[model samples]
Each structure stands twice: as structure tokens, then as C-alpha cells.
Target chain A: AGERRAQNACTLAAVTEKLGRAAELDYCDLEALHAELEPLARSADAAPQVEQFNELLTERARVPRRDLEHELLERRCDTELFVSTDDSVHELREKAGLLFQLSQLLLPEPRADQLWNFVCMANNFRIKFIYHFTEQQSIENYFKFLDKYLSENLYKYMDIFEDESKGITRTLIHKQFINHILEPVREKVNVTMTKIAASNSASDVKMLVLLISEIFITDNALKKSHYYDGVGLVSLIDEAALEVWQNFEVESAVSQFEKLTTPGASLMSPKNGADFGKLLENMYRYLEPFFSIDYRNLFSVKYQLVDEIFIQLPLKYRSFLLSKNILQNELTAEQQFENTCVKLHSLLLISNILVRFSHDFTFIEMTQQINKITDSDYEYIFDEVWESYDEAVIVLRDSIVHRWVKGLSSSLRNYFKYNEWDSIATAPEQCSAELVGALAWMKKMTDIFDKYWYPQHIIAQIKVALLENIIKFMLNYVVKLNKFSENGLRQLTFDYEALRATLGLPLEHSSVAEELALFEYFNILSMKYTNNKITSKFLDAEYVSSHHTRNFRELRESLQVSHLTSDEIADALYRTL
Target chain B: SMPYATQLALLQDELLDMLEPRDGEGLRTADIIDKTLRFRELLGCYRLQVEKSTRQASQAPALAQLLLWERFLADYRRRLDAAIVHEHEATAAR
Candidate 1:
């Protein structure tokens, strides 16, 4: 019985001893141990046994004593322990497998040391199991177990992730777990595909493609690589393409074709179809080669090619599955074309597979080819498309104008209600400049539409929109400036010279005429079409002739009245206007 | 017991020996930097020891002070160079 006790003690002591060494190994030299122990500790047959304690002592001596003590404490207390007496390796393997599953749950939060320990333990368990199990069967079972475990515990991991304040530690743990499973699979698939490509093996290529497709279609891949934020990864690719297109002046090319065809007539005029088509074909001929070379390399073919294979498979399969439903519609040619275009756009936007394949192709070259087709084979179609595009732009600009007005009106109303006019008035010049600049920009757009379309109604609508938006933006800005100046005057009796300098204006000359002219200039600008007109009371009439005079005092009094009791002022303005 | 003067003389000799250049030896940047900063601190401790030794010769404070300074200076350049080299390699790899 004493001998048996000693044997049991030795076994327990040996386990403790090995765990201590493992801990020390982890603490002082984690990377070294990972590189060294991973291969040796792979199989249960090769796993360091209690009998190997003497040999371990020599190795353990090399590590620091503090590291050893820490490791021993960590492993003995933190990890689940299992002991098997059954001689049958299969029985031991079964028990070890069960213990491994329990250990994952029972173990403390995975540190670098803990992750290493788990990997070591798993390898040992695998080696032992392989003695009784076929390699393929073991791999299959491992995956099956892991899948079930992940499905059940993913939410738990998510909760842990949310609560964990240490972002770097969380990232490290996540990376390690992902790489643990993914690395082997990625290597295997890459190697297989490379081999198939090198050999030009048809069957292998097909299988590789299918495997890639499945990998791409996996929900995790879709979520992480394709759509992490509001913008899909494909949109980034589109943005890159758009950047290239902008540099290439594709819009200018479109305009040039329009100009050549139109002469005195609008480019969208049906009679100009033939000329527009010919011009487009000529432009495409000039653009094709530059697109071909630059587009391909910019897209990074290898990464995208692999990504695409996976994305295309599911979509292709789904289309096949639903072909009958699609065929039953039997749509007209125009409707069919429109439907196809919509589908194409959606596919381009959503499918990483399409991006992968098309990334290398230059949009310039593609557009050039498209232009050529429009010119040669589809002149009337091209004319109609241009007309439609112009119409859309007009509609879009109108909507933008409406939204701008509503937003400005709301903000102005809020300012009035809250007595926030002073804040707006004192706002920086940049804000005023931006408002003025927007008006100029809209006017430019209107000019472009007028030059291209020559449609009287379209031009008239655009002119009204531009005029209204400009007036609204400018009026708000001027009113705010006037209020700010008035506040400044009330606070510090308006130093006319200082105020003029502050507003970046020169001082008036000795002539009272010059001083009066300045006041009249501002008054006219401020109350151009308003009911409250500027009177001569605020003006130095000696400097002004009566014919040149305006009701500047009425404007000043009205503005001062509006400044007090804002609601009453608002009602008064409503009545006056 | 050794006189306080004698202890001082012995300590001075030991320190001179530690500072002396030897064959196959070079001072490291880190060793020089550390010594320059820490020598004053060690000297303060030495002064205390000397005072303690005069008060109680049985304490052997001077001998203790000499030993401490000697240990701090010995092989310091080699150790400092090794540490600096390791840090440099780490930074280069990154």
C-alpha cells in the first residue's frame, strides 16, 4: 500500500512538476517554447510523461526559478486535470478528448501562457488519439466538435469581449483563436490551388474554385472582409475606380462628344444621334490602351481573384436555381435592358468576386469601348441616354435647392425663436464665403445645363431655382452680419472708423458726400426689396442729393423694433411682408 | 580593529583598481552614462558607511561600502553593452 501511495504521489508530483516547467517555459521564453515544444508535444505517444521528470530537471534549471514557480501555480490551479489508468490507448484517448472539452470551459481567461498550454495539451491529446484513430477521421471529428463548441460559445465570447476594457489583449486573443483554425485551412487551400494552376489540371481547378467559393460565401468572410462598416469593401474599389475616372476626365470626354454632335442644336436632340455616336466611337479609340494596363495592376489581382471565386459561386448557383422564375417574365427589350443594368449595378456593388475580376480592368478603357459601341451600333440609344441623364441632373438640382431652402428656413426660424441671431451675425467670414460660393457653384451648373439641353422650360426652372437659393443664402448672411454689427454698436457705441477697418473697409474721405454714400450703399444692399425701406434720417443729407436718397431710418427703426420681443417682431414682419 | 584611516586607504585602492583600464577592455556608452549618474549616489552611501565605521568599528562599514561599490562597477561595461545590443536588435526587428 505504501509503494502504491508512493507511485500515486510520484504521478501527481510528476504532473505538477511538468506543469511547473511548462509555466516557466511560458513566462521567460514563450516564443521559443512555442517553436520548440509544438512539434515534440504533438502526439500523446511523445507527450512528456512522469518518467521524463529527471530529464526535464536539466532543461528546467536553465529557466529562472521565479518563472518555474509562477508556471506551476498557474497550471495546477488554472487548468483542468485528467488521469487515466486504462491501458487501452483508445479508452485513454476518449477520456482525454472529454477532458480537453471540459478544460476549455474550466480554464481561466486565456493568456499567452494559457493559449500555449492549451495548444500543447491539444497536440498531446491529438497524438494519443491518432494511435487509435485515423488522421482523416480525427480531423473531421475535431472540426465537428469545434463547430458545435463555437456555435454555443460565440455569444459568451462576445459578452467577454464587450466587458473587457483591455483592447490590445482582446485583439491578441481574437487573432490567436482565428489563426489557430484558419492558418491550416488557408495554407491547404492556397497550396492546392497553386498546384492546380501550375499543372493546369482541369478537375483540380474546378475543385479549387468550388472550395474557394464556399470559403468566400461563409458568413464570417462576408461580414469581416466585405461589409465591416456602412461601406462595403466593393464600394472602396468603386471609389478607387471613380478616382481614376475623375483624373482621366471622362465627363469632359462625354461633353466633347455632345459638343461635336450638337453644333447649334442640343446634343440630346434625336437628329444629332448619328454625329454623337461617331464622336463617342472616336473618343473611345483614343482612350482604350491606357485603361487596359493601369486598371489591372491597380486592382491587385491575386487577393481579389481568390476573393471573387468564393463570391461568384453562391450567386451563380442561386441564379441557376431560380432561372425558371426569371424566364417566366418574358419582358420587352427596353425593360429587359433596364432590368439587366440594375442587376449589373447591384452585382458590381455587392459582389467582391466581380471586383476581384474587374479590379485590373481600367474604367477608362472600358468606358472607351462602351462609347465605341454607343457610336457605331447604338446612336439613337446613346442620344436618349444623354437626354435622360440631363433630365435627371435637373431633377436632382431642384431637389437639392428645395432641401437647402427648407433647412435654411428652419435654422433661421430657430435662431429667431432662441435669440441666436447675434451668434450667426458674428460667425466667421469663411461661413459667409461658403454661402456665397455655393450660389456661384449652382449658377455654373445652370450654365452647363443651358449650354447642353437648350430646353426653354428646363433652363427657366433651373434659373428660378438658382435665383431663389442665392437670394435666400445671401439674405440670411447679410441679416446676420447686420445684427452682429448692431450688437457691437450697442455694446460699444459704434466707432465708425474702427468698425470699417474691422470689416476690412477703408476710412471715408473728408467729404460728407463720401460718408453719406457709404451709408446709402449699405442701406440699399440691406433693404433692396423689403417693405422697411431706408430713410434719410440716419444719413448726413448735406452729403447727399434728395434724388439719390432712400428711406434708411425706416429700415434701421424696423430692424431695431424686430430685435426686441422677437415674436412680436416676427408677427410685424409677417404683416409688413 | 583597523583604524578608520586605514579602511579609507583600502577603499580608495579598491576603487582606483575598479576604475583602472585593463587589457582587452572597452567602456560601453551605457556603462559610462550609468556610472556618471549613479557614482554620486554611491558616494553618499560610502560617506554614511565611513561615519558608521568610525562610530562602531565592529560594523566594518568601510569594507561593506568598498565591496558594494566594487560589485556595482565590476563587469558593468560588459553587462551594459549586452543590454544595449539586445535593445537595438529588438528595435531593428520591429
Candidate 2:
């Protein structure tokens, strides 16, 4: 670790020799050259050479091992996992899981360039494997690679049951080679993800996704709809699902519960009534950990698809279920507003759940339990919708909400754009009654929020948002159109106490960045008016800010700190000019 | 109509395609620096919208994600710059 300042003929010669080994790597082969340097430096003053070697290893790969070996069996087993394309998907994913672990242990923590090289190596093997699987990409080869993963594992288990080397059929080895050998490579698969995050070239992104699809989803994931993690809703018998609340693997769970515990006729006992509310709780205890393993792998391996999977699959389901329940398949004039409160509840639950771990998963589930009073459109089996899913639905929903808000703004503008206030310079302070009228006109759906069931404060909050939007709109127009009046001036100078007190919206109408933006807008208008001398033309004797130092000098400074740039500032000035 | 991520994908491809990490002089620092700067500018402008979009869609805010390319560019700049200069110096000495 010490930095030696001096070097010698022998050390310099060796350094030059290593550097000029026709340099196959990005840096000199410090990883390889360290072996030769190690013994020479053991007794001699070759710390400088050793340090240089260590520095490059650190520089190039970010992790170094003077001597690192890729295990022969590990290599072969790695080859085997991806080789058998027709091998059941379970085996494929398990192989991917194992490879994910191996990637963590692989020496010289890969640079972005190194990530590409390793991936390129995988691509080489993959194409050949694809060729090998399909023999020629024939329809027959497609069938060739379409083998059941679970059956293959069962086959392994069955063979182990046969005579396996005096019984070392350890599940971990079957899952990911032997953990003992991997113990030294104590690196978890997640470490490899940091490398993935580093080098996200197009092909690398695409390759990682393909690898994830191959490795993560299996018969449990893709094929089955009735159950999850070996326990799912009971298959409908006699054209009806015998169990409608359909918790876990209904049939398998029922059978297992019966088999595992005393056959309870009802509650927890055979003698008691069927009240084993504890069943789902117990089922989850065992099942939660099984899928959790793959989730860690998916998060670790897919690296890219984590957000897509988390949001669209889980969060969307939660919100969608809540909204439909709140609305009950019936679109009331006021139901949409009511639906949004539930939607917001879901929003809080979602934001909380995903950022951490499963801390919010159970809370989200509990909220999901407030069942609907039966709207056919609102009804959905939990497992059914997730059968074919992604983030598209949620993305569309966000876009729709934005569009809806835009529509609301435009409608409000349509009412005012042609009114007596068409270009009249005014602010809510000078025109409170008129402003109140404009807001009522804009908040056309106020009755929707004033629903019989919605809490009063909640409705007040909604109304405040509308008022703020309207007021914000008015301020924007006044500044832009050069229609500044005394009332508008009053509105801009003080913190719009008039408008804020009227709206009473503490929810989210204020931010330091937004306040600065507001001030900047007013400043732009006043600066342009004075500088361009347009006060006489458009400013029908209106008030403008030449007010004393309740100093806004720091306003400009704070605006600069916000890390946002406005093209509008220059563009507005240009238009005025 | 497209998702924010889709737009970003389009942006990524176009930005990367137009990006000139090298020129007649070979690996122009100016070229890479310019592209990286523009990428930062583009991202800064688009980030709030991306944040809103992702939060609504996936419940995941993309504040850090919007900066991921910056992380990549920083590493790429340092390593590629030094390595190329080293190459340049080695060639000159030769």
C-alpha cells in the first residue's frame, strides 16, 4: 500500500516489458504481470513496479486479483446451463441465476468495456446455442428447444433418488453449482448489476432483457394462471370456481392444508367449523420466500426491467383495483372525483411500497381488500389480469391525466378568452368577485367534488387546486400580454396573499422554484416595459413595480440555484423587442 | 402518445448516432464533451416531465435515472481521454 518513489534497471526493464507485451488489454497486463513481479519484488525494492501494476489493475477493471482462476467445472457447468435450450425453462433460469452469481465472482470487476466483452462472449455462445438448439432455426428446432424446465429438474431429482454419489443431491448445487466453491466468490449477483448499470449500450440493454426473459419467467410465471408459487386459485369445478375469494393455489393449498394439518372440517380443526382464516397467512409464509429468490435474481440480472416490472405489474394492479371498487362500474357525475381520492390513497401506498422493500406490500394488500359492491366491470381476479401485463397501461393513464388537465385549462380559457376580461389588465385582488365568478366557471365540476361521501376538507383541497391553476393562468397571461394593472401589480408584489387566502391551498401551490419563476415572469415584463418604453402603448395607466427594497435582489440569485433554465426568458424578451 | 421512456429511447438513439466521439484528429475531446453537455441540457429540460411520467406510470421517480447517462459519460470521458492520450504519447515517443 505504501508508495515507493524510486525504481531500478531491473524494475524499469520489467515494467517496460509488461507494458510492451504487445498490450492486448486496455492497460498493461497487470493482472497477469503481477505474478512475475510478485517474487522479484518480494526481496528487491520493486514496490514501484508493484504499485504501478496495482494502479493499472485498479484503473482498468476497478478490482484486481494477481492470480484468479475461472473454475473448469464452473466454466463447463456455465456452458451446460445455456447450452440446453430445450432444457425446461426452470433449468434455463436456474442457469441464468447461477451465471448471475458467477458474474459477481468473475475477477477484475468489469469496466463498461469489459462488460461488453463478457457480454460479447455470451453472445458468441448464445448464437451457437441458438443454432445448436434449433439445428437450423427450423420449426422443428423451435420444438427442439421447447423442453419443460420443471420436468428436467424432476428428472435430476429422480436420478439423484437413483444412486447419486452417495447422496450429494444438494438443492443449491442443482440450483447454482455448489455454493461451497462459490463461497470464496462471496460476491452476490447484485454486484454484477452495478457493472450492467455502468455500460448500458443498446445491444447490452437488449441482451440483458433477453437474458432476463430466458432466465426469470418459467412455467410458474408464463404458463400457469390458476396459481402462483405452487399455490393458486382452485381451478373452476363444474363451471364455477369453488372458492371465489380464491386466495392462493386454491386446490393445491386446500389439499396441502388438509394434508399438513389435521383435517379441519371447518375452522382450525376437523371438529371445528371451516374458519381457518390462518390458511392464507400460513401459505404466504412458505411461498413468499420462494418467489422472493427469483425476484432478487430478476432485479439483479434484468437490471433494466426492474422499474417496468414493479410499476406496471404490481402498482397498477393495486390502483386499478381500488379505482374500480370506488366507482363500482358506475360512472356517477361525482364518482370520478371520489375515485381520485382512492386513487391518491393508492398513490401513497405505491410510492411507499416500491422505494423500500416489501414493507408496504401487506399494507397495499390490506387496502386492496375493501371489496366492491359488485360492478361487473369492476370485477377482476387478482391473478387473471397479471397473466399478460407490462407498464403500458400505467404510462397511458399518466398521459390521459395530463391530457385531462390540459382540457380543463383550455375549457377555462375558452370561457375567459372572449369575456369582458379579454385583454383587460386585472388581478384577483382588484377583481375578487369577478375572479370568484371566473373560478366557479372554471371549476365546472365542483359538484363532483362536493359529493355526499367525500370529506369536506378533501373537497376544499380540490377546489383550491382549481383556483391556483386559474390564478396561475391569469398571472401568466398578464405578464405575457403586457396587461399589468394595479391589481395585478398588487398580486405580483406581495406573495399573492389575496389569491392564496382566497384559494386556501396549502396542498402544493408553492415551491421556492415556482415562486422564483413567478417573480421572474413579473420582472421580465417590467424590465421589457421600461427598457422598450412600451408603458404608454399597452399599459393603460397600470401599476408596475419600481417599489423599494423589500429586496428581490436575492430572488434572481435563488432562481439561478434551482438548476432549471427557462428558454421562455430569452424568447419572451425577443418577442417584446 | 409514446411513453416517456420510448421518447428517451428515440432520443438516446438519435443523440448517440449524431455523437462524434472522434474526428479526423481521432477521439476529439471537444466532440465528446459537446455531446455530453447537450445530453445534459436535453435531460435537464426533459427530467421533470420524465419524473411525472414515470411516477404516474411505474410509481418509481426517475430523478437518479435521468442522470445515469451522466454517470456513464463521466467514466467514459476519464478513461477514454487518459487512454487515448497515453496512446498518443506512446505513438509520439515511438
Candidate 3:
């Protein structure tokens, strides 16, 4: 708006007075200054004359702008923003705002280069804030001071002038704050952690962790309070944890496992279970403090326990469970049985502890409240050991079951060979001694399975398998006993009924009825064919004539052999006839 | 074998002793971090032992103290985080 150049003495005198008051210039003063300098300066009369006039006005305008610039520089050095009190901060903000407004008035548009001093003034206040805030040992006070001065509204003058492209904005303020503020904090945190690591004491480590938690908690609160505002600071907790791991005494722990195995303790012995369980329990206690610090390393060190010690233990000293191809003469039947069971007991115990270890890992994750995933990282380690234990059980199971079945079969074979079936017993009250012994053996074998805590389904299979094999042997023996007296038939019937009673099935029940009927059929065939003695029902020739076409109806009815099909009955009748 | 009740009682007494303020002495950060970890370890042991003994139910006294320390640590965690961010932003201005 300034148009008239200062041409004569009167106007030049007015320019001097107006420019001198530039620091206190109002809007009207700007108009008066604008009118004198700008108008005739553009409309030149002669080159030298106009040039002389423009130079005079320019020189006069420079004094006020230069004076204002000098005043700003001087005030910046003297002005302290909010040193000791909250009230002073308010005063400082009002004072800074006034200075900012004065810069805008003295330097009007089209020549906004004068706004440079305003940027310097705003930046000076920020420097003072940073200086005062850092001097505080209580970081809480830093945030307290931040809330006092650092605000977008404080820099709203930039928005009013639209000076964001050339001058300070809120973002620039934050960026400068982070560069100056976070650098030193990071340095201090790193130095403290390093010093604590160097000390290498439990107390020092504890302090480091405490400091880490301090930073961790503070960072968390800042984020929650929106004070963090996406400032990318390194995690102090992570740095501290890393420092601890680098310096901690993991070497001493390696020897504990070495000491355990140095005494020639048998890996396959039952005591190994108790010994290893205690070892792991001790390891858990030692490693418990570390779980919070570094869960990964806790697993790595435990990996040493399992990988270094037990992995070698199993490889170096093998159990009979893995010896599938050993000679019969290497161990007696009874010795083999004892050794296998003993090994199984030890293996099962280890398996139980492995399960416990798995739960321990799970508890650590739950307690730490970690990132929940479908499966834990160390589950494979436990499952790996568990798989081996199962392998051991699977190998031994076949031999043991086969041994029981063969042992019972051998007993029955010997009984059948020695007993006199041709001569009938006077009376048959109970089953043979051999049959009673076989039943006892079945009960004992099942008890051993229960004692070892075998799975229910496997135990069921074993029971059914034993019963099936026993029935097969009994039928084989019956076929061998071709000829028998009347008493012999009665003895066989009594034994079969006793077997049914032991099985908890009625003699007429579907499961056992067919077998019972077969036994009765055997008795009838023996009485008529082998001994040439006609049974009472087939004794009558007329009875035989009437039933001849009925295909041994009398014999089938007398023997309770209806379960046998007509074809089977006729075949038996033809053989006997 | 010592009863779990006696063992837990002894541990609690020791924990309380550790937690109690000393004469004219402020608790060190070291002690705080250590005790918190130690308490967790002891709780793990207690629960493990109880399971081994086939015992369950009744976790009143231990739980009360446990919650106290838990909340105590939780507060410390919050403050620590806020302080870190504050220092970070404050120093960046430098």
C-alpha cells in the first residue's frame, strides 16, 4: 500500500519519524510508510533523479527493518521461556506471540523476507524448552514441560501467514525435538545397560531389568496418552535384555548335565527317571528368572540339557527294547521279561516328565501372556522324546504278547499229551489243572499291562487276542482227542462249561453256545463211532428207521447240536454210520 | 517330605520380608526386579508341587499377595513406558 517516495525535506522528515517507530507500527503506520515509499518510486521522472529518490526511500526503510532484526536477535538471547514456574510459561507464550505479531506488521506482503526473524524467534524458544527439560532427572517433568509449551496452536501464526512452506510447522517442531531429545536418551539408556552388563552380577542384572521395565512402562504410557505420536524410538527393554544375554553365565550350566552322567549312571535304569526329573526341576528354578528376560534363550539352554545329555545317553547306552534281533541264548526267557519291563518302566517315567516339561513351557507362555499361537515352539522337543518312548513301547509289546500266548499254548500242548482221554474219568467236577493254570496266566498278564499303565484300547486288544488264541488251541486239542470213553466226554464238557463260566458268558449264550454244541457233538461222535457204543436215543432200530430220512435227528437232538447246519450234521452222521 | 502348606507358608513369610521396607532405605530397582521374578518362580513351584501331591482348591492368602505384586509391577511397567517415550521426545528436540 506504500506508494509515495520520500522526495523533499518535508516528506523525508516524515519518513525518518515513521521508520523510527517501526517496532511499534500499527496498520495505519504501515499504510503511511507504504504510501510514501512505493507510489512515485515506480513512476520515475529521470533515470538519475528517480534512482536517487528510490535509493533515499530504500535507505530510510532499511533502518527500521534492521533495527527490528537487531531487537529480535537481542531479545532471543535475553528471553527465557518458562524456566521455574508455570506462570512464566504463560507469560513467555504471550510475549513470543507479541513478538511474532510485530514481525508480521513491520514486514508486510510482497517483501515477506522479513519473516525470517520470526522463525528464528520461535526456534529460540524451542531450544530453551529442550535445554530446561533435559536438565530434569525425573523424566516425568520432561513430559510435564512438553504439555506446557509444545502445542500446534502455539505455531498457529504460521497458518495465519500461510508460511508453512517456508517456515516452522508443528511437524518440524516434533522432528527437531526427537532429534535433540531422543538421541541423548538413547545414549544414556545404552550406556546404563552396558555398564550393568559389564558388572555381571545378579543385582546388576536385576537393575538392568528394572531400568528396562522403567523404559518399557514409560513408553507404554506415552503411547496410551498419545504423547508418543508415532516417534520411532528403539525399545529400551529389548536392548537391556540383549545385554543380559550377552553377559550371563550359561557355561556353568553345561557342566551340571556332564556331572550327572560322569558317574556311569545307567540311562536305562529306573533311577534315571527320578534323577533326570530332579535335574530338570533344578534347571527350571535356575532358568525361571530368565524366562521374563529372554524366553528364546531359556529354550536354547534347555535344548542343551536334552540335546547334549539325553540325546547322547540314548545313543551311547541302548535298551533291550531297541534290540529286536538278539539271539535267544543272549538272555533267558525270564531275564528278557524282567529287563523289558524294567526298561519300559524307565521309559514311561521319562515320558511322564516330558509331558510335565511340555506343561511347564505352556505355563511360561501363559504367565508371560505372549502372542498366542496354535502350537508352542518347543512342543516338538517334547514330542520328539515322546515319540521315542512310544517306539520303545511298540517294539516290546509284540514280544511280550507273543511270549504270553506261546507260553500258554505250550502248557496246553503238554497237558493234552500227558492226559489219558481214552479212559473216562469216574466223575468230572472241575476243569483240568492245565485249563485253570491258563486262566490264571490270562489274569496275570492283564494285571502286568495294568501295572505298566498301558492304553485302554491296547489292553482290550491284548485281552481279546489272548482269548482268541486260547480258543484256537483248545479246538486243535479237541480234534486230536479222537476217541474218548463216556467219562471222557463228560470231562471235556465240564472243562468247556468251566471255560464259559470264566469268560462270564452263560453256557447257552450266543458267544459260547456254538463252541459248547461242538463239544457235545464231539462227545456223540466219540461214543457211537469210536467206541462202537450206540447212544440211548439211536439205540432203537425203529427210531433209527423213522428218523433215517430226518438226517440223524435223534443224534442231533440228543447232543444239542442244532447250531451245526443240516449239512454238517449229515456229514458227521455219514462218518459215524 | 515336608508338607506343601508349611513350605508355601515359609516362602510367603520370606516374600513378605523381602517386600517390607527397611529403615530409612528405599527399595532398590534390583531388589524389585529380583523379588518379582523370585515370587513368580515360587508360585510356579507351589503350583507344581500341589499338582504332584494331587491337591487343589484354596489359594487365598498367596493369591492376595500375588495380585499385590502383580499390580505393583503393572504400575511400574506403565510408568516406565511413559518415561521412555517422554525422554525420547524431549531429547529429540535437542
Candidate 4:
């Protein structure tokens, strides 16, 4: 009787029309709103508008936010960043899920052929790229295997595939992957609840952890329909990292470390092994940051490392260090050095490949799936991994330092062993040849970097170390200069000052000061040597007039005149003398 | 993200890339699409090969490899043609 007389106001269209005009429901009452909605739920004709209600808020929302659809299409590299002036992310996960999920409906199948064409294109790429069963091998394999057609053939097909349609299709697939794996977990808790810490920006951390663990880790299929844990975490570390680790060689290094530690650990006596002890400490300091952290976090750190490749050093991660160790561990300094370098290098390469083929690589899928894990939302996963890796780089760098030091140490020991103890007195004349020649040997240390292709940024530290070690070796005769044969003293003088000049060959003032600090004992030796005619000749009046020396000497003079009296004025350039 | 259909489609794309059918005498777009679909149709055939090849072949690594290529062939076999490719019209320009 009532239906025949009048249509109910509770129809889906009627309610949506009301929302379209007055989206602000802040003043609406519980009884009135529910009374209207309850009947609509009871009505058979009402379309499902519960999903529609979320977007109505988005459309009516006054706050500006990242547009979810546009981002996927543009590949803008950031997830949706929603902000609420309401100052509450009360049901934020659900809201974001709705937005992202709704965006999926916007994805269209532009043609029957694009996805298929995509497959065809990828197949052609594989054949020419991986399977060219070339029955011919030639001296010209530099690119000799080109078979005259592959490059152009690749170029043509690549052009054809580069059309807007393929890109649109990729975007569609990208969005689909993200929504299926990523969007659902916007509200899914078990996938994200790790408990260490947080911020007001819950969504960023939440989304990151969910997105990351989901994409990075895999399923344990047998347990919960969605249970995720350390069970399949190994899949994240995977074979790519291993392959990258395998690509490098520490052969000369392996040979060097073995020699340094060989049973002939005599030069390694408590006193003679003093330098080795110092190196061990520094090696530990670097390696500890990496190994001490949870290995899972370390693996994640490795994943991010892909970005730093191709743009070699000098711009970043270059710190010339004086070695010192802290942090204890099970492995010997050398063993830790090998383990960490292999890991760090592998991380570098694996991350490199992933980044290089950002689209095709497996990580993207991993990135799109697996939103379940721990106590806090996924944010902790990223921040924890990030914090560890940054600190761990110093460790990575330190491992390389230990290897280089090992290489240089063995070289130095061999030189010391070959020469008799009294050679300075007997063949002081030959000492210059020895000094200059030893340098040529030390310069060969550059090959270690070239061989393994350590980050070019390491060159700065290497150079600093090169200067440090060279100057350290030069002054082995410092206070005992008179004991040398006059000719020996003279050769020492000629070679030492030239060595000092070589430090100036290439260095910014700061870089020089950096090396100078490492060679501080040498700096004071140069000052002491200033008292000798040989070094005075090297730091001739013209050289002393230079800015660095002028600044250095002026300070010495000022200190003797003003800051201190009597005893302090004793040796203005102190070198423990 | 974990949908079976999307996965099958992705497998299809990946399989296409693994097939070797190009050169001075490269396949036309339609032909490339056709060959890829053919590969998809054969995925199940290859999966069965591992058991067929166990007396015929062996080992985790090799067996693992056989599983992959066959799976690639089996994927997206029922999918409609989705890759409407434009003609690849060039050999070279200078």
C-alpha cells in the first residue's frame, strides 16, 4: 500500500544525490541517518553504494593530496600521500584502499593486441639477446657476434614496441599489480604490525612496510592463507645478490691476506705485529656495523644499494680514515673482511641489476605483494633497514681498507725481508733506488681497485692511504738520521722531500690536510727535517714562502711568542721529538 | 597482486622474451605474437617433460630449469590476443 502510494526516499539514487549536494555530514544525527540507510539496505533495488561513499568524500575532500591514478600512470615513484584536515587517519587504510582500488576500474583494455604484442616483443628480445646460437667465434667478438642484423633488428622492434599503447598497457599492469597486492593491505593489519616504533605519519611507514615486505618477502603457503614471516625471507636475499658477489675477485687480496698471516708470524711478534693489530681494530669498526645488525635488514640494505652504481666515486661515501677498531665478533679481521666485501659488493651488483632493469626485474612483483608481517605497520621495516645500511657502509668501506692494507703489508714485509738489516750503512747509495723503486711497487696498489673495481670514490681514501703509508715508511730513519752513512742520509733526504712534493702533485688543500693529519708524524718529521740542510733544500725559501707553509710556520711562531713560555717553545713543530 | 590470472599473463610476457625468433630475418609483429602464443600453449607440455625426462634427464638445477621453460609455455594459453603490435618497419637508417 505504501509503495503504491509513494516511492521511498531511501533509494540509492536519492541518497547519492543527497550526498552529492551535501557531502558534509558533520551535522547529521544517528537516528535520522540510520533510519534512512537501514531501509535502503533492506530495499531490493538499491545498488551497492557503500564503495561509492568513499569516493564521494574524496571528490568532496578539501584537502589536497597526491592523486593516486595519475601517479601510477606517470610512474611518479611515490605512493598515495593522503592528509586529513580532520587530523585523523581513523579509517585511513580503508580510505586509501578505496581510492587505489577504484583507480583500477579506470584501467582499460585498449586493444586485444597490445598485451599479446607485448609478449611477442619480449620473446624476440630473448632470442637475439640470450639464444643466438652463433656457430661462429672470431677475434672480433668485441661485438663480432652481431651477425649484421641483431642490432638493427633490435632497434626496429624496440621502436615499434615503444608506442604509447605499450606504455599504457604497462601502466595498466603496474596499477593492477599494485592494487591486487598493495592496495588490499592498506587496511590489512597482520601483514604490517611490527612493534619497535612510530610517527604521526602512520600511513607512510604503514604503506612502506606493507609494500616492502610484501614485495620483498614471499609466502609460506602451508600455514595461514596470508601468514608471512622469516620462513620465506630467504627468497628476498635470493640468487641475484649471489651472482653479483661472484663477479668480483679478491685473488691478489686472498694471496696477500694468506701471506700476512702465514705461520711465519714472527715479524708478527707482539711489537712487530703492532701495525697488524692496529689494522684489525679499524677493520672491526667497519665490519661490525654491517654484521651486527639483523642479516635480514642487511639484505634489504643491499637491495637499495642498486641506485649508487654507474656514477662512480668522489661525489659520495669517500672518507679517508685513520684505522681504529671497536665491536667484537667471531671472525678474524681478514675473514670478516672477505665476508663483508663479498656481501657489500654483491648488494651493490644485485641492486644494480634490479635498478638497471627496474621494470623487468622480479623485485617489482615482490614489491607489489606480501603485506603481512609484524608488530608495527611496515614503516619500521624500511627505517630499520635504512639506518643499518648507512652506518654499515663505513663497515663496507672498512673491509676494503683491511684488504688494501693486507696487500700493502705483505708488499712491505717482503721488501724488509729481502734487504739485510745493515743495508743503509753499506749501500746508502742504493737506498734512493730502493726508496723510489718501492714507491713504484706501492703505486701498483692502485691495481687492487682496478682489479676488483672497488668504488671509484675509494680512490680518495686509497690515495690518502698511499700518501700515509709512504710518508710513514720514509721517516723510519727520522731521529736516527745521523746513524745513516752520509750518502744514505743524502739519498733519504733526496727521496723524502720529493715524496713530500708528490703529495702536492694532486690535492685540494683540504684533501692535503686530510692526508697530512694521517701523516702527522711525517708532518713533524718534515719540521724536524727543516733543521737539516737536505730538507731545507726541499722546502727551499721559495717553497717555504708558499701559502701552506706560511700558514703553518706563522702558527708555530705565534705559539712560541704568545701562547706558551719556556718549555712549550722547545720544538715549535713537535714530532714526538 | 596475487591473482592467478594476472600471474598467468605476466608469465606469458616473460615467456615471449625467452623465445628466440628474430634476426636479419626477424618475425613480423603478427608472427611474433603468434609464436609467443604458441609458446604459451606448450607450457603444460614441458612441465610434463620433467617426469618424462627424469628417465630422460636429472638433477635439481637442471630439473628446475626444465620446470621453468615448460611453465612459461603453459601460462596464458587461454588468454585472448592482447598485444596489437604496429608493424616494425625498419632495418636501419645510417
lDDT string for model 1 (A480-559, tens) is 33443333222212223322222211112111222333333334333323333242332333323332234323443544
Name the docking class for model 1: incorrect
After superposition, candidate 3 runs with Cα above 4 Å error? A1-271, A274-332, A345-390, A434-450, A477-577, B1-94
lDDT of 2 by residue, A123-191 (tens): 333343445532012222222233332223323432322222323243323322211212111122223
Candidate 4, TM-score of its B chain: 0.35
DockQ of 1: 0.01
Q: Please tell me which model should have the higher TM-score, number 2 or number 4.
A: 4
What CAPRI class is candidate 3? Answer: incorrect
Which structure among the candidates has the greatest lDDT? 3
Model 2: per-residue Cα lDDT at residue A566: 37
Q: How far in Å is the alpha carbon of A238 misplaced in model 2?
A: 28
How much is the lDDT of residue A56 in candidate 1?
Answer: 44
Please tell me how candidate 4 rates in CAPRI terms.
incorrect
lDDT values, one for every candidate: 0.35, 0.36, 0.47, 0.35
Name the best candidate (by TM-score). 3
Put down candidate 3 lDDT per residue, A212-276, tens digits, no spaces.
44554444444444344444223444634744542343444444544544433222345654565
TM-score of chain A by itself in each prediction? 0.24, 0.29, 0.42, 0.31
Which segments of candidate 2 are over 4 A away from where they belong?
A1-283, A286-334, A337-341, A344-431, A437-472, A475-482, A491-517, A527-577, B1-94
